[PDB]
Amino acid sequence: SLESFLNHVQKRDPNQTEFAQAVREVMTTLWPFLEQNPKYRQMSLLERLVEPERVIQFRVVWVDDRNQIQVNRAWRVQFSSAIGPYKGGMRFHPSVNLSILKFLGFEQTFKNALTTLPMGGGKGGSDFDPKGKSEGEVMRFCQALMTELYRHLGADTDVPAGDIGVGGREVGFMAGMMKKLSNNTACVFTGKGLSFGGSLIRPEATGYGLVYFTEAMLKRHGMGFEGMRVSVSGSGNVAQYAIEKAMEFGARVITASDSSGTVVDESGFTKEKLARLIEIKASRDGRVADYAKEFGLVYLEGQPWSLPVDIALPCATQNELDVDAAHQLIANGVKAVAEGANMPTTIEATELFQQAGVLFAPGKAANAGGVATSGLEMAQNAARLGWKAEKVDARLHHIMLDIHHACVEHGGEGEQTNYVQGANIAGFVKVADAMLAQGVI
Amino acid sequence: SLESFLNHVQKRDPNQTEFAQAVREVMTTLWPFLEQNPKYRQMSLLERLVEPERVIQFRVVWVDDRNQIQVNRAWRVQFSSAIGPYKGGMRFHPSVNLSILKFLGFEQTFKNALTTLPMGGGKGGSDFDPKGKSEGEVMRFCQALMTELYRHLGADTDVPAGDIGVGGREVGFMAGMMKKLSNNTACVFTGKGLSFGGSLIRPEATGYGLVYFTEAMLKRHGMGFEGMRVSVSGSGNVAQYAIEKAMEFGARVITASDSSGTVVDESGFTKEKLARLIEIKASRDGRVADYAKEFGLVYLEGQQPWSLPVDIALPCATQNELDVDAAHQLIANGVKAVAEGANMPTTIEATELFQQAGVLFAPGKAANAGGVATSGLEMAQNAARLGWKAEKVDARLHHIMLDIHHACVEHGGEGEQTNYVQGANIAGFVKVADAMLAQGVI
Amino acid sequence: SLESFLNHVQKRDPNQTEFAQAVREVMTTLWPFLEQNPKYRQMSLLERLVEPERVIQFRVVWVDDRNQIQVNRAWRVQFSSAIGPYKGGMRFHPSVNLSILKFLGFEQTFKNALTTLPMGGGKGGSDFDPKGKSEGEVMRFCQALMTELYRHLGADTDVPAGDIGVGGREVGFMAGMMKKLSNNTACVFTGKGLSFGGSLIRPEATGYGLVYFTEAMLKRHGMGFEGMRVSVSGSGNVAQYAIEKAMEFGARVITASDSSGTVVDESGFTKEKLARLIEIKASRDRVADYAKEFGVYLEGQQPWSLPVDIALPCATQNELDVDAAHQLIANGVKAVAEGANMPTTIEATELFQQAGVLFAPGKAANAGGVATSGLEMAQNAARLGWKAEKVDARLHHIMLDIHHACVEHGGEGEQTNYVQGANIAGFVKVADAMLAQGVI
Amino acid sequence: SLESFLNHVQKRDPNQTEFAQAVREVMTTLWPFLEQNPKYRQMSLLERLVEPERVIQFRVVWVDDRNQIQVNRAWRVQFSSAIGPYKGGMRFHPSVNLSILKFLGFEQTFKNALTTLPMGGGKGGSDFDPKGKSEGEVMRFCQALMTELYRHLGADTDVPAGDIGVGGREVGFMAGMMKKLSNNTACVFTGKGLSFGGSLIRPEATGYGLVYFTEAMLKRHGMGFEGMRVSVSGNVAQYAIEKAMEFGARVITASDSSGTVVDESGFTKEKLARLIEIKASRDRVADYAKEFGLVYLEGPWSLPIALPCATQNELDVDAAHQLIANGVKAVAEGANMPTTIEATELFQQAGVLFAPGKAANAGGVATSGLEMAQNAARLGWKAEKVDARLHHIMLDIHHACVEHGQTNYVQGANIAGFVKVADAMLAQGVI
Ligand SMILES: [Cl-]
Ligand SMILES: [Cl-]
Ligand SMILES: [Cl-]
Ligand SMILES: [Cl-]
Ligand SMILES: [Cl-]
Ligand SMILES: [Cl-]
C-alpha cells in the first residue's frame, strides 16, 4: 500500500532523505481520499506526479574579490507545470542539494495550486553561501548563474522568486541580467522592487490573508472577527499585519511574543502601540521584553496560550504549540485557531481542537497570502498596470476567500468542516484533474 | 456585378461547393451596403478578404489499438488576423474537407469581429473519425496532430477551440501536448477545463447569449420573452442553458428534443425539471424519451417541435434542422420571433421566407456568438493570470450581446423590422474591412 | 562638478547639439538634489544613464511613383529598459537625426517613468519627408522600414508610436507589416485606430491630461479653472480637447491659433463653436476662416498679448518667449501649463517662476498622452476594450499621481515648483530600478 | 592534492560512486603533468573541469502493449563543450543513473577531444529497459523521450548517438521524431542509417582504426605487422583482422564466446569471408575451424601482437605473463578498457608496447565525427574517402600521444586528451 509505493519510489533515487520524507508526508494524507476516489489512482497519476517534469543542474563559475575563481552548482527543478508556469523560489545556501530543492518544489506544487491562481510548482537555488560575500560577489554570482538559467525561465515557463539566501537584492540582480540577455521586460521573477515591477502589500500579504481566511470560515458559521479576544504569538510580517488587520476588524488582540517572552495588554493593541513595536523591535533587533516595559504592560517569561481568548493566531515557528496548551484554551472557550507560520500545531494537538469543536485553519491555507500576492504580482505585470495598495488588498482578499471555499468542498458534509483535510485534498485535486485532461504527457 | 465577382472568385476553387455558397450569402448582403459607401471596395477588399491569409494542410500519422497504422489529413485555415489572432474550432469528422473548414472559417471571421473582441478568424480539424475510437486512440491522434500543428499555433497567433467531434476531452489532449512541446503555459487553446484555465460561463454561454440577445430583439419591437410560448430544439449546452435563462426571464419553455424525439410540456419547464433533464442527458447513453416518462410529458416519436403554435422559436440542435416545410407551419401558426441557437439551423428558403412574414429573425452569427464571445473572455482571464467570478464572466457576456444587438440595429433597414441578417453581416464586415485598409498591404 | 561631467559626456557626442542641450537642462535641475542624496552619484548612475542601452541605424530603400529607387536612413534609439519596454514615437522629417532622436528618447525616458506605468524610454524615425508623398509612397516606405525594424521590436521589448510626420496612417501601415512579418497580434505599436486594437480617448488624452493636471495645481494653491479666463495656443488634438475639458470645468476659453493668426472670443468658447473649429481644422488648408463665420482675428500674432489667468500653449516648441512672458505676468496671469513640448523658453520659464506664477512644465502635462498610450498596451494585454469612462477615469488618476509626485519633490517655498518636482520625480523611479537591477 | 582535491570534489555528491571513481582514474594520471605544468592547475581549471556544464533530468511517460502507463527517468549530461558540441551516445538500461552517465560523459569528453576533431563531450540515457519490449513500445518511448530532449539538442549544440540498449534502431526513432518536431534535417545524431545521413565504413571503422594506430606505433619503433603472429577475438575484430592481412600478416587466432580457433598460415581473404559471414549470420567458431581442419581450444593467450576485441578485462594478469613466455611484444585493446590494471603496468614494464583503449578503438568515435562532417557538407563521401580520412585521424591521434610521452602511450593519451580540453577552456575566458 502506502509503504510499497514509497519503497518503489525510493528505488528511483535513494540517499534523498529530504525528498523521501516529503513524498511520505504528502501521500499519507491523501491515501484516505484516494481510496474514496480511485479516479485519481489510475493511469499512473501518482507515479507521474512524484516524478519531476525536468531538473536542471548547471555549472556556475564566478570570481571573488581576491581574484580567485570559485565554482558552484546551481539547480532549477521544473517539477510540475500542470496548472501554470513553474512558480517557486530560489535558495542560496551551502547545505543545498538536489533532494532538498526536490522536496521544496514538490510541496510548492500543491501549495501554489491551492491559491486558486494559475501557478505550477518548482524550486531552485545553489550551494552558494552568501554569508560574508560582498555586494559585488553576490552580484557577479547572480549573473554568472543567470548566464545559463536565463534560457530555462520565462514569463510563461518558469517564474522564480525569493527564498533563503535570496532576498530582494538577489532577485533584482537575477531579474536584471535576465532582462538584458533576453531583451524582454516581462515578469520573470516575483518579489521585485517597487521601482521596476514589484507589488505593494508584498510584506503585508501573509498577515492580512491570515485574518481574511479566519474571517472567511468564522462568518460562514455563527461567529465572526467582531469584538473577540484574540491571542497572537510571534513578531514579524506574519504577526505584525495579522495583529493590525485583526484590529481593523472588530476584534481585540491582547498578546505578542518573541524568542524570549510575551507581552500582555488586556486593554488591547492600538494602531500606535503596534507601530512603536514594529519600528523599535522588528528593525531595532531587538526584544519583546523591552516593549512591555515601555508601555507598562504585563510581561511574561516562558507563551500567550494561557490567556482565555476567542481566537488564537499562532505566528512563531513550526511546532510552537502543543497539546497541553490547547487543553487550557478549549476549557476557557476558544472557538477559532489559524496558523501563521508553517505548522505550529502537531497532529495530536490539531485533532484535540477538531474533535473538540474548535475551528482550525492550517498554515497550508492560512499563510497562503504570501504566495497569493506573488501571483497577484504576475497579474499586475500582465496588465501593464500598477495596482495600488487598496486595489491589491481587495484582490488578495477575494483570493483568500476562494482558498477558503476550496477547503469547504472537502471534508466534510457534516456536521462541521475539516480544513486540514480540506486543504491537503484541494491542492491535489486541481493538479490531478488538470494532469488527467492534458494526457500523456 | 455580383455574379461576375462570385464567378470570378469561384475560379480559384471550381470545386468547393460549401465555400462558394458562403461567399455568396455574405457578399450578397454586403453588395447593397457597398453601394451606400464604395470606400470598402477601395483596395479590392473583396478579393483580399475572400482569399485566406494562410492554410496549413499536414499529415497526421497514428496507431490504433489493432497495432495498425492509420494515416489522416488535417488542416488549419487561418483566414484573417486583422482584428486579432486566428480564432476557430477544430472539427473531427469524416465529411471534413478543405472547402468546409475554409467555409466555416470565413463564417467565424465575421462572427468573432461582431463580438467587439480582439479576435481574428480561423477554423480547422481533420477527417479523423472519433466515433467508436478508444480513448487511447483519440489521445494518440490529438498528440500526433499537435506534433505538427503546435508550431503554427500561439497565444498571440492562433488559438483553436472545440467544434463538432472535438469536445473537452480532445481540447485537453491537444492543449496538453501543446504545453509539453512548447514548454509554455500561455493560452493556446480555449474551451479548457476549469482545472487548467477554463472559464465558468463557457457552457452556459452559447445558451445565455441567445436569451440575452433575443430578449433585446423583442424589447425593441415592444415585445418580450416573458409570457410568450418558447419552442426549443436540442438538449446540449445550447438548448439546456437557453431554456434555463428563458425561464428566469418569465418565459414558458414548451419543448425540448433529442435525435430520437421531442418532449412537449405545456406546463412549462422548471428549475427542478431541467435539472433532471440535464442530469440524464449528461450521461452518454441517456435519451430525452426517458425524461418525458419521468414527468409524464407528451413525447413525439421522431418529430420536431415546429408542429406546435409558438411565438418564439429557438433552434438549438443541428445544421439545416429547420427546413421550408417546418417553417411554413411556424409562420402559419403565428411565430413572431426566431433566434438561431445552433449553427446554420435554418435554410436559405426557410430564412428569407421567415422574414417576409414580419417574423423577427435573429441569425446565428449574432445570437449564437454568445459562446465565442465567452471564449474570448477565457483568453482575457488567462492573459491577466486571474480567474474571474461567474458573475463577472456572465455580466461581460451580457454586455457583449447587447453590443452585438446595437451593432445589427445600426445596419438594419429603417423599416418595421431591423432584419438582423443584413445587420450582422454588415456590422461584422465593417470592422474587418476597416482593419484591412489601415494595416497597409498586406 | 556639473560642468566637468557635462563636457565629459559631450566628449563622445561633440556635435550632438540637441542631445547635449537635453542632458544639461536635466542634469542642472537634478544636481542640487544629487547633493542631498549621495547614493545616486555612487554607482556611476549618471554616466550610465546618459549612454543609451542600444541604438539601431538601418538603411531604408523604397521606390517613388516615378519608379525611381530612393534611399533613406532610419534609427530606433532604445534608451532605457529599466522601468519597462522601450516606449516612444516615430518621427518622419528631414531634420531627423541621431542627435535629435537621442534627446527625444532621453526625455521620453524620465517622462514615461513619471506616469507610473511600466514604460521604458525610446524614440526613432527617419529623415524621410512625408511632405508631398502619396499613400502608396508612404506605405511602400513604412513597409520597407518595418522590413528591418520588425526584428528589434516586440510587445515586451519595444512598443513605438507616432510623432511628427507619423500620424494614425503610418502607425497602421507599420503595425500591419509588423503583424504580417512577425505573424503576431501582440501590441507592438500604440496610437492605433479603434479598428484594430486602438484605445478610446487617445486624441482627448494629451488635452484632458493637461487640464486634469492644471486643475490639481490650481486647487492646490486656492485656485481653480472655475470662473477663470484661459488662453489656448494651438489647433491640433491637444488644443481641441484642452479647450473642451476647460469649458466643462467652468473656464472661459478666449483663444485658439495656428501658424497664421489667433482668434479671440472674448465671450468664450462653446461646445458648438469648438465643434465647427475642430471640423474646419480637420479639412486642412484655417482658423482665420473660423473667426469670420462667428465674427476678432489677430493676424500674425499670438494669444499671449491678451489678459488671462491660465495660459495653455499647445502649438510648437519655444512659442512663448520672454517678450510674451512679461506681457502675461502684467495682465494678471496666475498660472501657466504647457500643452505642447517645451513651448516656454528657459528664460521665459524662470521669469514666470520668479514672478510668483504657477508653472506646470511639459514633462508632466504632456504625460496625458504617453500615459494613455500606456493604457492602450494595458487594454491590449487584458484582451478587451475599456469604455471611454474607464480610460478617462484611470487617465485622470494618473495625472493626479503625476501632480502628487511633483508636489513631493517640489520646493518648500510659497509654490511647488514643478520644474524640479517633475524632473526629479521622473529621475528617481528610473534610478531606483536601474540600480536594483545590477550591472547591467 | 593527491586525495585532498578528490575529497573536495566528491563532497558535492557522496552517493555518486561511479563518478567519484572516474575522477580518480582521470586525475591520478594527470597529477605528474599538472605538477610539471603550473599553467593547467592555473585558474581553478581542474575544479571547473570536473563540474559538468549542464545536466537535464526529465520525465518520460510512455505506454506499453498492456495499455499500461509507465514512468521512466532520462538524462542528458552535457558535460563539456569547449572543443565543440557535446558528443556521446544514449544508453537505455535499468541500471542507468546520473552517477554513471556522469562518469561516462566525463570520460567521453577526453576520448572525443583526443580525436583532434571539433567535438565536445557528454553522455546520457534512461533507466528504460529495452529487453522484453517490442518495437512499438520502444518507438513510443524514443518519441516520448524525444518530446523533451529535442529542445536540448542540435547540430551545433549537442549531437548524441547510440550505446548500450540504444542501437541503430533507436538512433533512427530519435532522429526521426527530432526531425519531425524540429522541422530540421541537420545532423543531430550519429550512427544513422545509410538511407538518411549514414556514413560508410562506420562498422569497419572501430576495427580499421585499431590497426591503423597499432601500425603507426610499430613503425615508430620499427616493426613489421607480418612476422609476429597476431591473436584476435566481433564488429571490430572482423575488420581488424582484414586490415592486418592487407599489410601482409599472419593472424592465427579467432576467439569465440566460449572457445578459440587456432590457425598457422593465417587467414586468407576467402577464409576470413567464411569466418566472418558464417560467425555473425549464424547462431559457430567451432564450425569454422572444423570446416577447415584448424585447431580448436575450449578456453587464445597461451599461443605465441595481441588484439583483445571482446569483453572488458579480456586479458588478466594470469594469462598476461603467458604472453611474455612465448615472445609477444605488443598489445592493443579493442573495447572499453578491457585490460586488468595490474596486467597493464605489467606488460609495459616488460618492454611491451601497450596501446590504450582511448586511443586504439578511437576509430568508432572518430568516424562518428566523420559522419557529422559528411552531413555538414550536404554530400556523402565514398567508401574510399571515409576510410582515407579516418586513417589520417588515427595517425594524428598517434603522433599526439608521442608528443606527451618505448613511448608510453598510456600516459600520452590521458595527457593529450586533457591538454586540448584545458587549452581551449582557458582561452575561452571564465564561463
Ligand atoms: Cl561559496
Ligand atoms: Cl520573494
Ligand atoms: Cl478514421
Ligand atoms: Cl504568440
Ligand atoms: Cl500616436
Ligand atoms: Cl522499463
Residue numbers in the entry:
A (entry chain E): 6 to 307, 309 to 447
B (entry chain D): 6 to 447
C (entry chain A): 6 to 290, 292 to 301, 303 to 447
D (entry chain F): 6 to 238, 241 to 290, 292 to 307, 310 to 314, 317 to 417, 422 to 447
Task: Show sentences the authors wrote.
In all, we determined 23 structures, four of them not deposited in the protein data bank. These novel structures represent enzymes involved in stress response, specifically methylglyoxal reductase (YghZ), as well as three enzymes important in core metabolic functions, phosphoglucose isomerase (pGI), 6-phospho-beta-glucosidase (BglA), and glutamate dehydrogenase (GDH). All the proteins are oligomeric (YghZ, pGI, BglA, GDH) and belong to three different fold families. Based on these experiments, we demonstrate successful structural characterization of multiple proteins using only microgram quantities of purified material.
Glutamate dehydrogenase (GDH), catalyzes the reversible oxidative deamination of glutamate to α-ketoglutarate and ammonia, using either NAD+ or NADP+ as a cofactor. The reverse reaction generates glutamate and the reduced cofactor NADH or NADPH, thus GDH has a pivotal role between carbon and nitrogen metabolism, particularly in plants and bacteria. The majority of characterized glutamate dehydrogenases are homo-oligomers, consisting of between two to six subunits, with dimers being the most frequent. GDH from E. coli crystallized as a hexamer, consistent with biochemical observations, and contains two domains – a larger C-terminal Rossmann fold containing domain and a second N-terminal helical capping domain. The putative active site is located in a cleft between the two domains.
